Write an enzyme that holds these catalytic residues in place. Structure first.
Site, PDB file in Angstrom:
ATOM      1  N   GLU A   1      -2.820   7.997  13.162  1.00 58.85           N
ATOM      2  CA  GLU A   1      -1.927   6.691  12.547  1.00 58.85           C
ATOM      3  C   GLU A   1      -0.899   6.452  13.809  1.00 58.85           C
ATOM      4  OE1 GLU A   1      -1.965   5.006  10.416  1.00 58.85           O
ATOM      5  OE2 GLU A   1      -0.004   4.494   9.597  1.00 58.85           O
ATOM      6  N   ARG A   2      -0.468   5.366  13.999  1.00 54.45           N
ATOM      7  CA  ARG A   2       0.468   4.723  14.911  1.00 54.45           C
ATOM      8  C   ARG A   2       1.800   5.744  14.330  1.00 54.45           C
ATOM      9  NH1 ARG A   2      -1.901   0.649  12.432  1.00 54.45           N
ATOM     10  NH2 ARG A   2      -2.925  -0.979  13.828  1.00 54.45           N
TER      11      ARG A   2
ATOM     12  N   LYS B   1       0.860  -1.243   0.028  1.00 56.42           N
ATOM     13  CA  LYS B   1      -0.074  -0.140  -0.017  1.00 56.42           C
ATOM     14  C   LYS B   1       1.003   1.363   0.039  1.00 56.42           C
ATOM     15  CE  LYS B   1      -1.994   2.034   3.478  1.00 56.42           C
ATOM     16  NZ  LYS B   1      -2.734   2.113   4.788  1.00 56.42           N
TER      17      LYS B   1
END
Lengths: 538, 71
Positions: free
Chosen positions: A179-180, A153
């Protein structure tokens, strides 16, 4: 001019004796360890506004001074933000100095009005074959990306950033919503090595702005960080006049963060548990992503489906806005096909012959038919046999397998670690290349000739080279060399290979250590504010 | 135990004390991260922390969401 009245978690009420700030205005708390920005959510009455904090509210005192900025959250926009990482309130978190702001724009904005809208509907050409044929991207559209981990991705994100910057001349904004931080650092460092983000003096040759709101940020900071990504992409659309890509990484976490700030503001949750304003929390964001007369914003936004339930109200409200889906699959990824776009699962609203034309439509409609008829006979092959079924059903299998190979493509951002150069494939070369495999002009060529190539001018140049290879395998010979004592030592000679590892019984555990003496007396503050022991009796 | 800390907020402890124990265990473990060494933190039943935090929030009359959990 205003002072803190209430602190209940991430929700701060501040009190203005003069004029109140407008709803969605930005407030800065005077005197605090981190810059704390509040965004006004409502006017409560009795000269109080209720605010959602963009940072932690720990250490906040009732009566702290709060300054109204007179405006919503204003972020730096322009070409000076390219290649920078920016948080929700516009500060650089990439540790590379201040952001060269061409302008500072309010992150709150109405969608472009009806006369400003474009009545036309057209393809954003991506240079990826499986995306330009089977699920075309609308210019100004919203695209759901159903990828995951290990389906490539991120290298597909960076290839969209690459090809839109190279062909259409438009920049990109990556809005990482919740997001992490390990994954947001991974995307930053992979953008640096693939060349779409440059550091230092060549910062201006970058193609992507990263706007990050991490998971450890409060729910107000994550709910607005996708609008900070909009505002950077709206400057390129409205001032620079470009065809901008916007990547809202996990639009579900935008929904999830906005659902938390409604729950903290005391609103009654809707069906399954989302905010009552779910369709207008999404529709406020998604309607700024459109085509105007100046330029365009196209949004490739990743979609998480909760509990694998497409009828859940967070994907169902999101899918009303989406103009194409690109499903990345692991089954396509373990066949070596890159990009791992599933050619049947990926859908587009742009795939109908009144907007892409009938010569493009019947190719993509015919290619999908061939791949569908091949994959419903895969419990005919394994059950009965390969040479069992008819020659025409084997003619599809030979045609589908060299279509399923021909949807692969090497990427220009992946060539720094794969060796194979990148192939931007034009739209007419994609249709005309897939007309021929559909009719049968290339049934004589092998299937692995249709593998990781640009177009049909390069499938012939791969079958020529492979076919000859048999002429150049009689050059040398191939058997055994010196069975196992050529350079394979004895095992006890290999124990003396092993290098010295110095193992300390000491831990080295007092490097630079304060070692404060803590006393177990209870220390309080008296009424002077002076630190004092706790008084004896109640 | 010569390498292990144990932060123990047991069942009879107050719900504020079970809410704060993963955070106070993490700060003890963040010492080794911040000084170049390596840490291994284990929050055994992080789902029991959230039950303790839901107890404090419903009792502080904070508005509940799904399964009465806070926002």
């Amino acid at each position: 001019a205003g002072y803190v009245s209430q602190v209940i978690g991430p929700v701060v009420d501040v009190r203005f004796d003069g004029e109140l700030p407008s709803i969605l205005s930005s407030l800065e708390v005077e005197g605090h360890s981190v810059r704390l920005v509040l965004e006004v959510a409502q006017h409560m009455g009795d000269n109080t506004v209720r605010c959602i904090a963009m940072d932690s509210t720990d250490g906040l005192v009732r009566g702290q001074k709060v300054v109204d900025t007179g405006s919503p959250i204003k972020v730096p926009v322009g070409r000076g933000t390219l290649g920078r990482i920016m948080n929700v309130i516009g500060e650089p978190v990439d540790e590379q100095g201040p952001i060269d702001a061409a302008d500072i724009w309010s992150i709150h904005r109405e969608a472009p009005e009806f006369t400003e809208q474009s009545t036309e509907q057209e393809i954003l050409v991506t240079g990826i074959k499986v995306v330009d044929l089977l699920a075309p991207y609308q210019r100004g559209g919203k695209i759901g990306l159903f990828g995951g981990a290990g389906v490539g991705k991120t290298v597909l994100i960076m290839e969209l950033i690459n090809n839109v910057a190279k062909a259409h001349g438009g920049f990109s904004v990556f809005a990482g919503v919740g997001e992490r931080t390990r994954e947001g650092n991974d995307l930053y460092r992979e953008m640096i090595e693939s060349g779409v983000i440059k550091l230092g003096a060549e910062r201006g040759n970058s193609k992507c702005t990263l706007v990050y709101g991490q998971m450890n940020e409060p729910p107000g900071a994550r709910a607005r960080v996708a609008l900070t990504g909009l505002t950077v992409a709206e400057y390129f659309r409205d001032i620079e006049g470009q065809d901008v890509l916007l990547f809202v990484d996990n639009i579900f976490r935008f929904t999830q963060a906005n659902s938390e700030v409604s729950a903290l503001l005391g609103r009654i949750p809707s069906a399954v548990g989302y905010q009552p304003t779910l369709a207008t929390d999404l529709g406020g964001l998604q309607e700024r992503i459109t085509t105007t007369t100046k330029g365009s914003i196209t949004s490739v936004q990743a979609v998480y489906v909760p509990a694998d339930d497409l009828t859940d109200p967070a994907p169902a409200t999101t899918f009303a806005h989406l103009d194409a889906t690109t499903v990345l699959s692991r089954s396509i990824a373990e066949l070596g096909i890159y990009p791992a776009v599933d050619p049947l699962d990926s859908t587009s609203r742009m795939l109908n012959p009144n907007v892409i034309g009938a010569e493009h439509y019947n190719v993509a409609r015919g290619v999908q038919k061939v791949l569908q008829d091949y994959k419903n006979l895969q419990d005919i092959i394994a059950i009965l046999g390969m040479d069992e079924l008819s020659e025409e059903d084997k003619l599809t299998v030979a045609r589908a397998r060299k279509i399923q190979r021909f949807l692969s493509q090497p990427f220009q951002v992946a060539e720094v670690f794969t060796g194979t150069p990148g192939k931007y494939v034009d739209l007419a070369d994609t249709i005309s290349g897939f007309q021929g495999v559909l009719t049968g002009k290339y049934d004589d060529l092998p299937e692995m000739a249709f593998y990781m190539v640009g177009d049909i001018k390069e499938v012939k140049e791969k079958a020529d080279k492979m076919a000859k290879d048999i002429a150049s395998r009689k050059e040398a010979d191939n058997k055994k060399v010196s069975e196992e004592l050529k350079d394979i030592p004895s095992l006890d000679k290999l124990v003396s290979e092993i290098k010295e590892v110095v193992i300390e019984e000491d831990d080295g555990l007092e490097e630079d250590f304060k070692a404060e003496a803590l006393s177990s007396e209870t220390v309080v503050l008296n009424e002077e504010g002076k630190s004092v022991p706790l008084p004896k009796k109640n | 135990m010569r390498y292990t800390i144990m932060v123990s907020a047991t069942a009879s402890d107050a719900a504020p004390l079970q809410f704060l124990a993963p955070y106070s265990g993490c700060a003890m473990a963040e010492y080794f991260r911040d000084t170049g060494k390596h840490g291994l933190i284990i929050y055994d039943d992080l789902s029991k922390q959230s039950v303790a935090y839901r107890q404090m929030s419903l009792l502080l009359r904070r508005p509940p969401g799904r399964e009465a959990f806070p926002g």
